[PDB]
Amino acid sequence: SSQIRQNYSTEVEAAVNRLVNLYLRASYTYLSLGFYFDRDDVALEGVCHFFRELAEEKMEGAERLLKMQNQRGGRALFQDLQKPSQDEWGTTPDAMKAAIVLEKSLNQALLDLHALGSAQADPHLCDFLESHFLDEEVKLIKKMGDHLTNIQRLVGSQAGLGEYLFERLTL
Amino acid sequence: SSQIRQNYSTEVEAAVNRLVNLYLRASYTYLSLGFYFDRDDVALEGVCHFFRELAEEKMEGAERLLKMQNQRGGRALFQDLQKPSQDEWGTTPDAMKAAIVLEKSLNQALLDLHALGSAQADPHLCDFLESHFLDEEVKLIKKMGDHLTNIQRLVGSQAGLGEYLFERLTL
Amino acid sequence: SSQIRQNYSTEVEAAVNRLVNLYLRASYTYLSLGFYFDRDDVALEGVCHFFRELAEEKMEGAERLLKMQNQRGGRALFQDLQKPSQDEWGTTPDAMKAAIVLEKSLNQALLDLHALGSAQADPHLCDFLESHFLDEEVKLIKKMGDHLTNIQRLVGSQAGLGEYLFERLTL
Amino acid sequence: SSQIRQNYSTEVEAAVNRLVNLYLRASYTYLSLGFYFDRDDVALEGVCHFFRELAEEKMEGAERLLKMQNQRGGRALFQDLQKPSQDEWGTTPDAMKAAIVLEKSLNQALLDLHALGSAQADPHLCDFLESHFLDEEVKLIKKMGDHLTNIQRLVGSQAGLGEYLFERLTL
Amino acid sequence: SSQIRQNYSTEVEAAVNRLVNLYLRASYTYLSLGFYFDRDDVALEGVCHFFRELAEEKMEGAERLLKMQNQRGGRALFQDLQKPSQDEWGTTPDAMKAAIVLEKSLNQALLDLHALGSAQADPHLCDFLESHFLDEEVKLIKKMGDHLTNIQRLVGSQAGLGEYLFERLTL
Amino acid sequence: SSQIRQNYSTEVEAAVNRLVNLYLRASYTYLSLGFYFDRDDVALEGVCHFFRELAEEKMEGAERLLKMQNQRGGRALFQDLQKPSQDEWGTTPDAMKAAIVLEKSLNQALLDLHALGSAQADPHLCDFLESHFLDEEVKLIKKMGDHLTNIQRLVGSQAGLGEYLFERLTL
């Protein structure tokens, strides 16, 4: 048995492994989003960069979860990673909506894990999530909502022109 | 009685306290304008920053009035501060029009106080207002008019696109 | 409905708006305290500076609450601001006691909101308060208690002399 | 009665004093461990330094607890400090095992205090512990487990040689 | 049809997508290897760092392949990523052998793609692989063989001690 | 038996262990004095700092004794540490008198050990004490006497005011 594990439930251990899978899946989704916007027939560089940077952020999240798993004496277990939900991602608003869906799903998983940690009286977990994950998600989701509002306002006017201007002047 | 007060009428003293209330009310209005434009469903950062900066400017004006009140030997008296006139502020032109209404009201209050000071033969007051308030108001109102003209020219063309471009390229 | 709001109760949203009002009221109270000590017939500069700095701190608190409200997808609503409870604030101990009453009231409002957030299973709110508000209040209240003890020890000896020495050597 | 105390239970106050005693006892234990490894007939400098540094860390923890006690308006009460459990500490693995026992005991005391604070609805305490104590303990216990694994792997091979190599190349 | 594609076969396009999957799978495998060596009951930091760095290198390879796919006018298509072949990776020699198996498999896939490109008379592909992938693989495989020889020589002597010394003095 | 011990009596060895206990007890006493003056209802920061610094000095003394014990080939033995003689320490003169009592007791223990070393013809011990302990004690006791004289002169005049002025202008 583990020489360091203390107050770390099998329930939380399993939930952390599942959350790693979710973060790696998110990273994969963002890899796909980024490279779609790099296509010569899409060609929105600021959008490609926005999603490639998020791919990296989600990988960092997964790594942080895995370091914590080992810090607590749990055992990292990896599962197959499902491919992203789409092969083509449409226009900038389509993609930004998909991103917000994805983050809200990650945020609910974090909230669910926090609730489990509170049920399990695991304050270290609760602190860990609050400190590195919950505020980052709220900030990111707010940024994405601001972006969606701007993109929608622009493409309601003139879609092609609006997409270009958002990419050039916001991203 | 005050050991320093000299040539400072009760009329001007009361009028200065009223003008402080007006400046604090203006500050409050600008706080509300700023945070409305920070909403995820409005999301015009340059507009939020424009009004938050004015909130600070109006607080500075109130503070300057209060320092002067004490310099002259008058007594600062504070009243309840009424909430801003609106909870939601519409589009950028709506908000800029409301700002100009608000500043013209502050400018008339300054002009009224200057007239009172002249009637009371109070040249220190007259100098104080001219030096720190009257030119600032004229400059600010000119800037706001220039902004309104630009915003109107833009949103007459294509409203969503125009609002975005003003926020990105002027503010 | 809000495109970003998630796990943010109407109860907490309303409570945050109420707490903003409380912080702005506190800011106003401190504005009044500060300028009272700037009067030529009170003339305690270090005391004026102490309270003017707190006025600014409480405004910053209100602004932080309002940024968070929008981050979560709630809607800032502003109410009339009641004037401070006094027009004149007595001696330095009187003023410091009033300050401690005021902070304890803000601290209880924070504790009450934290309890609501815990009842609503809102860990982001709980983290937000703990990180930016609860330790600041405990630190500030400790400083104020230390000051009150010192002022009381001094003015028990010789009131005028003691008030002067506190202002010159502590503030 | 205390002019600053607010939402700070007698239960938590007493528990904090007990935790101070535990941290000072731990500091004492580490003082003893350190100087044992400084003996000419033990002579493992990196091990002496490892434990002397922990002695200092635990004293810092006690000091932080005591500052917090006063910040909250509680009263520090000190008890006799029991001497460490051993006069001689064996080999490096013996000592590292004893260290892990000691830290797990401190970590359980922290967890117990956090639970009490949660029962008492004391979020400031909960934040304090999470921010300065709970992650430090988890990090330190992980480091100690890593060290124990390495020392065990080495001394299973050739005990004297392995002890030397750990001290020279890890510590 | 693509406005830029020229001399880029559907065969090579599909083979590039498959090679991306292989590189992402390799990255995943290295993530797992790295975190296994970070376990408190394995605790070989230099080994964890060696494999975590390779995880990053393989992700970079995948990204380079994907940039090239778009440069040529092909379409990135992503598939499910299978989990690594093991959940626990044994001792340092076990892990290094598994790494060499993995790289030889990547190198054969590169050789196979180069042969296809030569059959398809696609010199750009051939240059791309030679310039960014084929020499990197040969260098990395040589390093891994050197490491395996050293680890084997050490653990043939005294396994625990040898594993430690390799981690401390080579990695 | 010890491979280094030479001219180091069992009598001096035991006396050094006892003196370590005395220095650690003194350190503890100073910890208590310091935190008493940090209470919100005592609130004399310069006094808290004066005693917290002495706590650290006495710990350093204990550490120096323990390094010397091992240098000579003796064996450090630790005993239970009795809690300080008081839970509350009164006014600044009360506390300074208690400090002088405490230092005079440490100084007599040093003198007693020096006499023992001279009886045992142990010149290294005699040099050690003279070089690191005896002049430090004489300097510290002189400083404390100077402080007591000043505090007494001040609080004979007006106790609260005098206590404040000493803390602000001497400490």
mmCIF file of N, CA, C and O in Angstrom, chain E residues 122-152:
data_model
loop_
_atom_site.group_PDB
_atom_site.id
_atom_site.type_symbol
_atom_site.label_atom_id
_atom_site.label_comp_id
_atom_site.label_asym_id
_atom_site.label_seq_id
_atom_site.Cartn_x
_atom_site.Cartn_y
_atom_site.Cartn_z
ATOM 1 N N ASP E 122 7.401 12.647 -55.156
ATOM 2 C CA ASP E 122 7.059 13.803 -54.308
ATOM 3 C C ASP E 122 8.307 14.239 -53.548
ATOM 4 O O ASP E 122 8.514 13.831 -52.399
ATOM 5 N N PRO E 123 9.194 15.026 -54.185
ATOM 6 C CA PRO E 123 10.470 15.379 -53.567
ATOM 7 C C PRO E 123 10.339 16.318 -52.381
ATOM 8 O O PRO E 123 11.195 16.322 -51.506
ATOM 9 N N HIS E 124 9.260 17.103 -52.324
ATOM 10 C CA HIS E 124 9.084 17.975 -51.198
ATOM 11 C C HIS E 124 8.891 17.151 -49.933
ATOM 12 O O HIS E 124 9.458 17.466 -48.905
ATOM 13 N N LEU E 125 8.047 16.128 -50.004
ATOM 14 C CA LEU E 125 7.832 15.231 -48.872
ATOM 15 C C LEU E 125 9.115 14.568 -48.452
ATOM 16 O O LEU E 125 9.431 14.476 -47.264
ATOM 17 N N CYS E 126 9.846 14.057 -49.437
ATOM 18 C CA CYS E 126 11.080 13.382 -49.177
ATOM 19 C C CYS E 126 12.062 14.289 -48.409
ATOM 20 O O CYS E 126 12.611 13.854 -47.400
ATOM 21 N N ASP E 127 12.237 15.530 -48.840
ATOM 22 C CA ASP E 127 13.063 16.563 -48.180
ATOM 23 C C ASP E 127 12.561 16.867 -46.785
ATOM 24 O O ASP E 127 13.327 16.903 -45.827
ATOM 25 N N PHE E 128 11.258 17.067 -46.655
ATOM 26 C CA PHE E 128 10.652 17.360 -45.358
ATOM 27 C C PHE E 128 11.007 16.299 -44.295
ATOM 28 O O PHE E 128 11.348 16.595 -43.142
ATOM 29 N N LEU E 129 10.885 15.043 -44.681
ATOM 30 C CA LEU E 129 11.111 13.956 -43.742
ATOM 31 C C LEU E 129 12.569 13.885 -43.410
ATOM 32 O O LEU E 129 12.940 13.624 -42.269
ATOM 33 N N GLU E 130 13.403 14.100 -44.403
ATOM 34 C CA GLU E 130 14.831 13.884 -44.208
ATOM 35 C C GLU E 130 15.349 14.945 -43.294
ATOM 36 O O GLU E 130 16.044 14.621 -42.317
ATOM 37 N N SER E 131 14.903 16.178 -43.545
ATOM 38 C CA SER E 131 15.299 17.386 -42.802
ATOM 39 C C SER E 131 14.838 17.516 -41.353
ATOM 40 O O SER E 131 15.562 18.104 -40.522
ATOM 41 N N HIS E 132 13.637 17.036 -41.041
ATOM 42 C CA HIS E 132 13.080 17.179 -39.677
ATOM 43 C C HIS E 132 12.818 15.923 -38.854
ATOM 44 O O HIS E 132 12.520 16.039 -37.665
ATOM 45 N N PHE E 133 12.924 14.740 -39.450
ATOM 46 C CA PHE E 133 12.467 13.524 -38.803
ATOM 47 C C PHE E 133 13.478 12.411 -38.850
ATOM 48 O O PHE E 133 13.785 11.840 -37.835
ATOM 49 N N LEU E 134 14.011 12.089 -40.039
ATOM 50 C CA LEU E 134 14.894 10.919 -40.135
ATOM 51 C C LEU E 134 16.195 11.044 -39.340
ATOM 52 O O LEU E 134 16.573 10.069 -38.681
ATOM 53 N N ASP E 135 16.887 12.169 -39.359
ATOM 54 C CA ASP E 135 18.125 12.273 -38.546
ATOM 55 C C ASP E 135 17.820 12.376 -37.073
ATOM 56 O O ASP E 135 18.572 11.842 -36.276
ATOM 57 N N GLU E 136 16.742 13.063 -36.689
ATOM 58 C CA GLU E 136 16.330 13.128 -35.287
ATOM 59 C C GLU E 136 16.087 11.740 -34.727
ATOM 60 O O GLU E 136 16.529 11.419 -33.622
ATOM 61 N N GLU E 137 15.405 10.878 -35.475
ATOM 62 C CA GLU E 137 15.160 9.527 -35.035
ATOM 63 C C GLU E 137 16.463 8.763 -34.912
ATOM 64 O O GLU E 137 16.644 8.037 -33.946
ATOM 65 N N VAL E 138 17.343 8.848 -35.908
ATOM 66 C CA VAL E 138 18.584 8.101 -35.783
ATOM 67 C C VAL E 138 19.390 8.569 -34.543
ATOM 68 O O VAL E 138 19.925 7.723 -33.797
ATOM 69 N N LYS E 139 19.462 9.877 -34.322
ATOM 70 C CA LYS E 139 20.162 10.404 -33.129
ATOM 71 C C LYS E 139 19.536 9.917 -31.849
ATOM 72 O O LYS E 139 20.244 9.508 -30.910
ATOM 73 N N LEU E 140 18.206 9.949 -31.795
ATOM 74 C CA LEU E 140 17.511 9.596 -30.550
ATOM 75 C C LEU E 140 17.684 8.096 -30.261
ATOM 76 O O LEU E 140 17.876 7.677 -29.113
ATOM 77 N N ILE E 141 17.544 7.255 -31.280
ATOM 78 C CA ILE E 141 17.707 5.842 -31.108
ATOM 79 C C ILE E 141 19.144 5.502 -30.659
ATOM 80 O O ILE E 141 19.351 4.610 -29.867
ATOM 81 N N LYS E 142 20.130 6.196 -31.192
ATOM 82 C CA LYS E 142 21.532 5.992 -30.742
ATOM 83 C C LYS E 142 21.671 6.358 -29.278
ATOM 84 O O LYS E 142 22.282 5.614 -28.526
ATOM 85 N N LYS E 143 21.107 7.477 -28.876
ATOM 86 C CA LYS E 143 21.143 7.893 -27.436
ATOM 87 C C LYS E 143 20.490 6.837 -26.568
ATOM 88 O O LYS E 143 21.024 6.429 -25.515
ATOM 89 N N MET E 144 19.330 6.347 -27.001
ATOM 90 C CA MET E 144 18.638 5.339 -26.215
ATOM 91 C C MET E 144 19.436 4.043 -26.114
ATOM 92 O O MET E 144 19.416 3.404 -25.074
ATOM 93 N N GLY E 145 20.113 3.621 -27.191
ATOM 94 C CA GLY E 145 20.918 2.427 -27.155
ATOM 95 C C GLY E 145 22.076 2.620 -26.174
ATOM 96 O O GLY E 145 22.384 1.716 -25.397
ATOM 97 N N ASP E 146 22.706 3.776 -26.240
ATOM 98 C CA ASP E 146 23.820 4.108 -25.307
ATOM 99 C C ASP E 146 23.286 4.024 -23.871
ATOM 100 O O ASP E 146 23.933 3.461 -22.981
ATOM 101 N N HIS E 147 22.121 4.617 -23.617
ATOM 102 C CA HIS E 147 21.539 4.533 -22.295
ATOM 103 C C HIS E 147 21.257 3.118 -21.876
ATOM 104 O O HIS E 147 21.582 2.740 -20.759
ATOM 105 N N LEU E 148 20.663 2.306 -22.751
ATOM 106 C CA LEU E 148 20.340 0.918 -22.409
ATOM 107 C C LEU E 148 21.598 0.122 -22.028
ATOM 108 O O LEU E 148 21.638 -0.616 -21.038
ATOM 109 N N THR E 149 22.674 0.304 -22.816
ATOM 110 C CA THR E 149 23.951 -0.355 -22.539
ATOM 111 C C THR E 149 24.449 0.039 -21.160
ATOM 112 O O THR E 149 24.949 -0.789 -20.406
ATOM 113 N N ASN E 150 24.385 1.317 -20.845
ATOM 114 C CA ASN E 150 24.831 1.770 -19.521
ATOM 115 C C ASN E 150 23.972 1.246 -18.387
ATOM 116 O O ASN E 150 24.493 0.794 -17.389
ATOM 117 N N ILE E 151 22.668 1.318 -18.546
ATOM 118 C CA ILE E 151 21.755 0.822 -17.518
ATOM 119 C C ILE E 151 21.966 -0.683 -17.296
ATOM 120 O O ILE E 151 22.098 -1.180 -16.162
ATOM 121 N N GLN E 152 22.069 -1.427 -18.386
ATOM 122 C CA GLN E 152 22.316 -2.884 -18.290
ATOM 123 C C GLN E 152 23.645 -3.234 -17.595
ATOM 124 O O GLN E 152 23.749 -4.183 -16.789
#
